[PDB]
C-alpha cells in the first residue's frame, strides 16, 4: 500500500464515477438540441469511454455548451488518470532499479 498505487486505485474509481455521471449528464444537456445524437444512455456511456481514452472515433459528440463542458471534464479526468497510472509505474520501476543497484 504505497502512495502511487493507492492514488492509481482512487483514480480508477473516480474515473468510473466520472464516466457514469458524464453519461447521464451528457444526455441531460443534449436532449432539446435539434440534431443532437448523444441522447440515450448506453451509447452515451460508450461516448464517455471514447472521450476519456481520447479514442474519439467521431460517431458521437456533444453539440451543446453544457454537453461540451461535460465532455471537457471527462477528457481531463481520463487523461490525468492515465498519466497518474504512468507516474505510478515510473515510481515502481525507479524504486526497483534503486534496489537493484543496491542504493
Amino acid at each position, epitope marked *: 500500500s504505497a502512495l502511487h498505487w493507492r492514488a492509481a486505485g482512487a483514480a480508477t474509481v473516480l474515473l468510473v464515477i466520472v464516466l457514469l455521471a458524464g453519461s*447521464y449528464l451528457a*444526455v*441531460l444537456a*443534449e*436532449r*432539446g*438540441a*435539434p*440534431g*443532437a*445524437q448523444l*441522447i*440515450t*444512455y*448506453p451509447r452515451a456511456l460508450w461516448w464517455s469511454v471514447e472521450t476519456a481514452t481520447t479514442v474519439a472515433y467521431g460517431d458521437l459528440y456533444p453539440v451543446t455548451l453544457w454537453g461540451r463542458c461535460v465532455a471537457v471534464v471527462v477528457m481531463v479526468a481520463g487523461i490525468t488518470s492515465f498519466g497518474l497510472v504512468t507516474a505510478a509505474l515510473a515510481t515502481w520501476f525507479v524504486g526497483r532499479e534503486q534496489e537493484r543497484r543496491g542504493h
Partner: antibody
Amino acid sequence: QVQLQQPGAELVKPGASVKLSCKASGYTFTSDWIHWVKQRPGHGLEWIGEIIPSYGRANYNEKIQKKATLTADKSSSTAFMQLSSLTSEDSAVYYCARERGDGYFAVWGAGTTVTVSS
Amino acid sequence: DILLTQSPAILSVSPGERVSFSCRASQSIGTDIHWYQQRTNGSPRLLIKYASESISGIPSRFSGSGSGTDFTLSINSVESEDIANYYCQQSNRWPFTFGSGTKLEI
C-alpha cells in the same frame, strides 16, 4: 399492474386550461423519461414533449405552437401536462409514455380524451 | 429533424400471407427505429425495438429488418388480430419523430 394511469376524459371551455396527469407504477429509474403524444381523431401520433422526473427538466417539440408545460411530482410518481388556452384544434387524445432513456416507448398510458367546447 | 416516410399508407393482404410495412428515414439513422401497433380505440403497443429486436409477449410472426434509411416491419401469416395502424419512430437524433402510419387491411 397498469404501468401508467391517466384519466379518461377532460372537458375544457375554449380559452381555458387543463392539467393532465399520468401516475406511474412498476420499476422507477433515475434515467426514466416521461413523454407526451397528441393524436387527433383519425390522425397520426405527434410528439409533444418529454420530462425527466428525477431532474425536472422538460423539452418540447419546436415545430408546433407550444401549448404544454410539463412538470413532475417525484413523491407521488406523477407527471403533469398543463395545456393552456385551448382551441378546438387542441381536442385530441393525449397519451403519456415511459421511455427508459434508450429511445423507445416501452409502455403507454390509455390516453386522456380532451374535448374543447362550451 | 428526421422525417419518417411510411408508404403505402394502406396495405391490403389476404389471410395467411406475409406482409411488409416500409419506413424510410430522411437521413441515415443506424438501427434506431422502433415499431408500434395501434388497434382501433387502443393505445400504441411496442412491437419491435432497434429495427429487429424482439419484444417479450409479441407474437413471433412479427419481425423487423433494415438499417441506414430503409426499414421494414414484417408479419408472417397475417391474421385478423393484426388489423391496426402501424407506426415507426426514430431515436437517433433529437427530437424523436414518428412516421405517419400504415393501415393493415385483410
